[PDB]
Design a binder for this molecule. Sequence first.
Ligand code: SF4
Lengths: 241, 67
Amino acid sequence: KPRLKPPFPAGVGLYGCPTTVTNVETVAVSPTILRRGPEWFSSFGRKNNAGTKLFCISGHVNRPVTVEEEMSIPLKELIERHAGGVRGGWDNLLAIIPGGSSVPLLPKKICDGVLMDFDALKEAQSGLGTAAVIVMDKSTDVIDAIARLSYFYKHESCGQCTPCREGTGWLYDIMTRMKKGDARLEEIDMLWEITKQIEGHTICALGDAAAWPVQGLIRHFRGEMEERIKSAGGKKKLAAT
Amino acid sequence: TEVLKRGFPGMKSVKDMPIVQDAPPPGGFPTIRIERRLGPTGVAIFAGLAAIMGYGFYKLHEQRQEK
Ligand code: SF4
């Protein structure tokens, strides 16, 4: 169950002693960077975004792979090469989450042209996250994917603080009703309002991690959700009359 | 909330909730009277009274002669 900042782990960490927590990848590259030089490390990437990165590519990819590549490489280059492209071709691509599961996803328009960078995906209202690639095609139910992500987050929330603990189930039920179309147009804005409610109001960032994917889902595919909502009337309102 | 009350299966939006109240019938109620809604000639009344009284006088004279 996480603590609150302030205080910091460096000020007070494990057993009240100074402590710095680091990622495996950041630690591992250090001797190579020390041995081969910060100048050599800075030779790659754009400004403030130097170096290489390990990339995990999954989804509907012809050649899923965990590969090392230079930063700032375009998604299209990073996927068509070293991963065999999209199953069914690039034109069959629907959406891609470029930074794992906590960052907003990007549609085909945004993805084609954008690079894998911290300061490039951020301005696209997304994030590099863990630089993990998930690829979805046109035969995929994007709503089901986001609902399953929300269910995962609901099961993964620790429940220490009120907003996340009580809103994960609410978000899951909202998404589940959206999946069957048993929802209304204004309830989409209601969902966005709830996401704004949770975001930045909890103890840790897990609330943001759960709120962000649905935010981007709505922002980039609100047409799909409304189409589903109306379409349920063709299979639910026929008995109401 | 109110969706569970006035909503119907397959309702697409909240604006579609029907409302059934005590309302005037189409066209409105018919018009009503508001203001106040309202004899014999005095000459005719006096003529009738005088005729009756004169008949009484003639009867009085006749009965007086008989008496
Ligand atoms: S946001 Fe969720 S997981 Fe994070 S501390 Fe609060 S309740 Fe726990």
